[PDB]
Design a binder for this molecule. Structure first.
Ligand code: VO4
Ligand code: VO4
Length: 517
């Protein structure tokens, strides 16, 4: 219900209390499964609102009459779930003095909780909510360069293929896939305060997957339901093409809304083996979509937000990649990999071998290693990057030894080359592999990740020295500290884990003894 100029009608989203816990379609209608048809234009439809009008939200003022405010200043707070304090912000574009502000009380979002007098003297009435055109990226002061990692708790990601806050990552396959769980681990454990999940597609016709068993789903950081810090955006198959395409703009706009408050948010865009009909045209001009995609992904970022006070937020984006053929030379994957800075190569050969997080350490990548190393170094461990590089070099080396051995067998391999396989094997089993279903190992804090890495690297250093001093590998393979090393991931007390470093040294020292110089 508006004019023509460029891209369709108004085309907007409402941003305020009860986005959280809400399950929406691709254009922000509350959830019963429904339909919008279009092109680059607009829609018809039915009567459901977005944020509810009836609901009365407690509003705490955070400014007084006489305050100068700009686009994005926080004028009040609303507890909205037991996890998220919602921040009421002067919408972008508006600045002035506060002439009127509501009082500690309970109000429905339709109320006016403030009036601002702009410099030319116009009076603006501010609601608890605000409207925003999904296709326009919400403004901000500055986009900071990648530098703070999105800690995921999952060893292989955090060590070898870090995501940066405000970074962009891709991962195979549909999220609903039962072959792996890192997708869930990512959603549930990343230190983003707010999760915006765009759950594309669905299976069968009984109707009840991600819909039912999710208001029940527990948030392990707080014991409160994960819904209490999530916004769900449903893409069903019986929904219409245009609503699905709009859904990710809807999601990212909502995400930008939460970063604007000073929150870190993660946005997960699911995806399915489905042919988008680009190759329907013949004469009238394409790869123009590749750039629509790009433009999407570069709406991600950690930013200085609008406001008077210095404030930072981020939108890190994780996107599912599911080529029509399960191919992976399909344009969908090329197109994504040309934009994203991080690929987590989920791998069916790993899953079959029950190597879990089935993330291939050889074909994955992160362009954020350098950008985050300083954070690790300054906060957790000065040796961080050196250590990841050394482990990566050992896994790389193992790869080559494996190749060669496929051909000529293991029988001719020298002790030093066996030692390398022994230790790379520890590295694969004691570090890479993580048990997502263990109550301790489901999450691995930075401090524990680096200690564990020290223990393995120290073991490796000692192993090589031992071999070089003539100690049989078989005597190293049996070293009793190995059994402890293979269990360290289940240990909660980081300093007990650390103590394995002296245990190793001692056990190796005994071994040097036994084999006089
Ligand atoms: O569930 V998978 O992303 O390893 O095909
Ligand atoms: O993304 V892969 O399942 O070809 O490692």
């Amino acid at each position: 219900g508006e004019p023509v100029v460029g891209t369709g009608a108004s085309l907007s989203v409402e941003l305020g209390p009860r986005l959280l816990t809400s399950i929406y379609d691709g254009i922000q209608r509350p959830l019963e499964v429904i339909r919008e048809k279009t092109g680059d234009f607009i829609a018809r439809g039915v009567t459901a609102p977005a944020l509810p009008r009836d609901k009365k939200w407690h509003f705490i003022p955070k400014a007084k009459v006489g305050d100068k405010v700009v686009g994005g200043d926080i004028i009040g707070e609303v507890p909205e779930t037991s996890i998220i304090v919602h921040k009421i912000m002067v919408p972008p574009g508006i600045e002035g003095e506060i002439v009127e502000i509501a009082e500690e009380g309970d109000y429905t979002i339709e109320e006016v909780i403030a009036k601002v007098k702009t410099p030319s003297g116009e009076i603006k009435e501010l609601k608890m909510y605000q409207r925003w055109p999904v296709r326009v990226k919400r403004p901000y002061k500055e986009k900071l360069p990648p530098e703070v990692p999105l800690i995921t708790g999952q060893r292989v990601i955090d060590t070898f293929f870090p995501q940066a806050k405000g970074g962009t990552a891709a991962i195979p396959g549909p999220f609903g896939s039962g072959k792996t769980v890192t997708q869930h681990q990512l959603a549930k454990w990343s230190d983003a305060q707010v999760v915006i999940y765009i759950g594309c597609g669905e299976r069968g016709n009984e109707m009840t997957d991600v819909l039912e068993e999710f208001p029940k789903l527990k948030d392990p950081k707080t014991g409160k339901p994960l819904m209490e810090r999530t916004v769900l955006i449903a893409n069903t198959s019986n929904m219409p093409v245009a609503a699905r395409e709009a859904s990710i703009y809807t999601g990212i706009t909502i995400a930008e809304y939460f970063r604007d408050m000073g929150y870190d948010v993660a946005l997960m865009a699911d995806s399915t083996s489905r042919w988008a009909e680009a190759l329907r045209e013949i004469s009238g001009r394409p790869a123009y979509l590749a750039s629509k995609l790009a433009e999407f992904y570069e709406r991600a970022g950690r930013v200085v937000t609008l406001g008077s006070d210095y404030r930072v937020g981020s939108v890190s984006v994780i996107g599912a990649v599911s080529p029509p053929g399960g191919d992976f030379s399909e344009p969908v994957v090329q197109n994504t990999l040309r934009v994203v800075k991080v690929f987590w190569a989920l791998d069916a050969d790993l899953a079959r071998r029950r190597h879990f997080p089935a993330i291939n350490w050889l074909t994955s990548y992160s362009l954020y290693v350098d950008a985050v190393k300083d954070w690790w170094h300054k906060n957790i461990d000065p040796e961080w990057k050196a250590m990841r590089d050394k482990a990566m070099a050992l896994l790389q080396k193992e790869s080559e030894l494996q190749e060669i051995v496929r051909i000529v067998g293991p029988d001719a391999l020298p002790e030093r080359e066996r030692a390398i396989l022994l230790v790379a094997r520890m590295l694969r089993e004691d570090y890479l592999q993580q048990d997502a279903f263990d109550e301790v190992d489901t999450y691995c804090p930075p401090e524990k990740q680096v200690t564990m890495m020290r223990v393995l690297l120290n073991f490796y250093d000692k192993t090589m020295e031992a071999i070089n001093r003539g100690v049989p590998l078989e005597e190293i393979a049996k070293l009793p500290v190995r059994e402890e090393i293979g269990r360290m991931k289940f240990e909660r007390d980081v300093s007990k884990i650390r103590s394995l470093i002296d245990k190793t040294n001692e056990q190796f020292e005994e071994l040097f003894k036994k084999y006089g110089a």
